[PDB]
Ligand binder design. Structure first.
Ligand SMILES: O=S(=O)(O)CCN1CCN(CCS(=O)(=O)O)CC1
Ligand SMILES: O=S(=O)(O)CCN1CCN(CCS(=O)(=O)O)CC1
Ligand SMILES: C[C@H](O)[C@H](O)C1=Nc2c(nc(N)[nH]c2=O)NC1
Ligand SMILES: C[C@H](O)[C@H](O)C1=Nc2c(nc(N)[nH]c2=O)NC1
Ligand SMILES: [Fe+3]
Ligand SMILES: [Fe+3]
Lengths: 391, 400
């Protein structure tokens, strides 16, 4: 368990301070093992400045060595803005800056808990997410006959319901998943194939995840158009329901919508908003996420359909949302963000999105007043987060 | 040796032709010896349509087998468009569709690889030839997605680099366009630029990706003009990993690593130049052979030997100038003519490859050059227009 800090500052080409600044940066890079990375880049704002980035990694929270580094740094003539992973508000929240920085989350994480066999199996699959690095191929799972049997039952069951209950984007993409990603009742699709297909449709990627991440970590991954997905399958004893995300939920629920460009933008938008957001704002985003990506409905003419991954992968949920006892409301993040919700029962309340581009715009407007030290932007050419000093 | 063909077509969701079409595709997938890939994707132009892409390779040119595929396919009720690598003009020119399809180029060299000319100073150096073989092999086996292998350069290799580096370094502040001076300290700080060290392509590629989305691929040697320029459409620069022979440090006709790293890389980290360079790439996608040649000439007179104007002064941004002491010391003098860059003018202009330029073109800015190149590209006869998708890193075809 480690605590990350990042220090930002800018300086102009031809500055009198650069010489000593650079020299200082060399000494700490060599003789301070808490420093993991120091880099400089062209400024996104002042076309004549350089942006600098100093990444530190400590074993304990609010390590005061950071202040020591800040002081020695600002002594060379620059003003430093420091972000940190912490419960305190001494510094604004840290965020992963590159898609490869999501590697830092890899080790940050019941019907069959009363089953040792199933428990050892879960342990083995989770090992793979634990060791996976950005850039690697996603290792393929040799699923057992039992596991494949469970997939088949869920698959065939949900397949009977999609055409009448799923939003049209889902019906649109599913045959492409069949034709390109090996979707079938007889075969559990591998994440590496799904990730390649998603990349080529909307730039989204998958990485395996051990289990539940914190809301901040998971949402931050979305900012890079990276979806964290489990590889294990639910226990065979209870096939038609599970309280947790298993591969059926990931692959039949989340993945198809990620191949729709407008949905893909919307999801990333939620991710961007989370980058560097305060804990209270993360919680608002997480709830918005629940009522859209997880349990959202779309409007299609005089009809209401499901796009939420938690609905699409649950026969009981799909056979519930259309009943009159379940309340429906137009999606509005100001209304949804504060709404309580059950995790162990069907939803009593669903929010209806008009269109994904509208949901994207609504979220962006919602997030616009989030307090953050930097303006966060995504650059599709560099595939990275741009950080602007305009606040 | 092989010739690529691409067949594509669309079909609407819910078409009753889909079942039979998929059945037909399964058949040729197993039984057609020349089929290399069949893929279906969401349409990027019609929200209710699917795009299908069939890729094929044939050992001979104008292979009449492709027509049978087109006939069979269109019997299933779709209208196919075919692109083909050929000196014939039956079909429009093939181009790589996805960034990873540049792997198809890995062995398409040509000259300045491990097959050297007899006047090459290292042609009868057996150590050097083995070294060029080794380094070429690395490019040969490199696949999109790999980290670029790091070369353990020898002390004689590092010595040659240092001679060139030190000689060039003195001239940069006075002779290079300001984008160079801006970026170079970052190359020193982030990519290991110094005279004691040859920078590794993987480090440069990471740096360029974060600056402008450009990346590096190691290349054996000279690619055909079409292949090289097509690579640019993806913001992919093919760069060599070998260094020139130690006997003649201040000159080489080949694009060795001193040329790539000291001439080409600094400008690619500038957003406007990087967009300009991609625009040239995009112009080449599906361009006729004749237009590829025109683009090549535009490239020569800009990316390789272009000048910028800064107030009353002329400076160099062309990689062939920045990496050559001789050339740097030539362009500023009145011994060479200077003209305003204009692709409609410059594209017909002749030029020597084995002497300094008698004529250089000045670009007002990389934004104007880009816009000029887009006008140029539009003047081509292309059967469709293309656009680049940075999210999918793919060329998208649009109807004309
Ligand atoms: O899904 S795909 O990867 O194919 C294209 C995603 N891309 C994201 C950016 N938006 C417009 C930004 S905005 O300025 O309109 O907000 C266009 C669609
Ligand atoms: O290099 S950077 O990543 O910093 C900015 C590059 N980016 C390339 C795309 N153009 C608009 C596309 S076009 O439709 O105007 O050609 C804006 C600038
Ligand atoms: C943030 C989001 O609303 C929700 O709280 C979370 N979802 C997930 C998560 N982690 C994983 N692996 N998968 C999720 O779906 N962390 C939390
Ligand atoms: C297109 C450009 O003008 C020139 O013809 C080419 N240059 C290069 C090439 N191939 C490589 N590898 N590097 C170049 O610089 N082939 C074509
Ligand atoms: Fe989920
Ligand atoms: Fe060159």
């Amino acid at each position: 368990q480690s605590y990350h800090s990042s220090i930002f500052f800018s300086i102009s080409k031809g500055s009198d301070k650069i010489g000593g600044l650079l020299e200082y940066l060399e000494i700490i890079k060599k003789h301070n093992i808490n420093i993991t990375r120091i880099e400089s880049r062209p400024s996104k704002t002042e076309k004549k400045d350089y942006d600098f980035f100093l990444d530190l990694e400590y074993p304990t929270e609010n390590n005061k060595e950071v202040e020591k580094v800040i002081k020695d740094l600002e002594e060379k003539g620059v003003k430093a803005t420091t972000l940190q992973e912490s419960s305190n508000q001494t510094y604004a929240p840290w965020f992963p800056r590159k898609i490869s920085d999501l590697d830092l989350f890899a080790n940050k994480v019941h019907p069959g808990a009363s089953d040792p066999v199933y428990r050892e199996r879960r342990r083995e699959i989770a090992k793979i997410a634990s060791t996976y690095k950005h850039g690697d191929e996603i290792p393929r799972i040799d699923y057992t006959e039992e596991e494949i049997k469970t997939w088949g039952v869920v698959y065939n069951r949900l397949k009977e319901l999609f055409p009448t209950n799923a939003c049209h984007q889902h019906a649109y993409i599913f045959p492409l998943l069949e034709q390109n990603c090996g979707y079938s009742p007889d075969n559990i699709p591998q994440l590496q194939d799904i990730s390649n297909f998603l990349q080529e449709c909307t730039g989204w990627r998958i990485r395996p995840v051990q289990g539940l991440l914190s809301a901040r970590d998971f949402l931050n991954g979305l900012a890079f158009r990276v979806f964290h997905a489990t590889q294990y399958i639910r226990h065979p004893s209870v096939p038609l329901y599970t309280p947790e995300p298993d591969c059926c939920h990931e692959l039949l629920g989340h993945v198809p919508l990620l191949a729709d460009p407008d949905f893909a933008d919307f999801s990333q938008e939620i991710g961007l908003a989370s980058i560097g957001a305060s804990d209270e704002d993360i919680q608002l985003l997480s709830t918005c996420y629940w009522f859209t990506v997880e349990f959202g409905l779309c409007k299609e003419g005089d009809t209401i359909r499901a796009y939420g991954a938690g609905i699409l992968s649950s026969t009981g949920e799909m056979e519930h949302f259309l009943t009159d006892k379940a309340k429906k409301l137009p999606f509005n993040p100001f209304d949804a963000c504060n709404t309580e919700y059950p995790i162990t029962t069907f939803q009593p309340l669903y929010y209806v999105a008009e269109s994904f581009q509208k949901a994207k715009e609504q979220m962006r407007q919602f997030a616009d007043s989030f307090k953050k030290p930097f303006s966060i932007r995504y650059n599709p050419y560099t595939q990275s987060i741009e950080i602007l000093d305009n606040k």
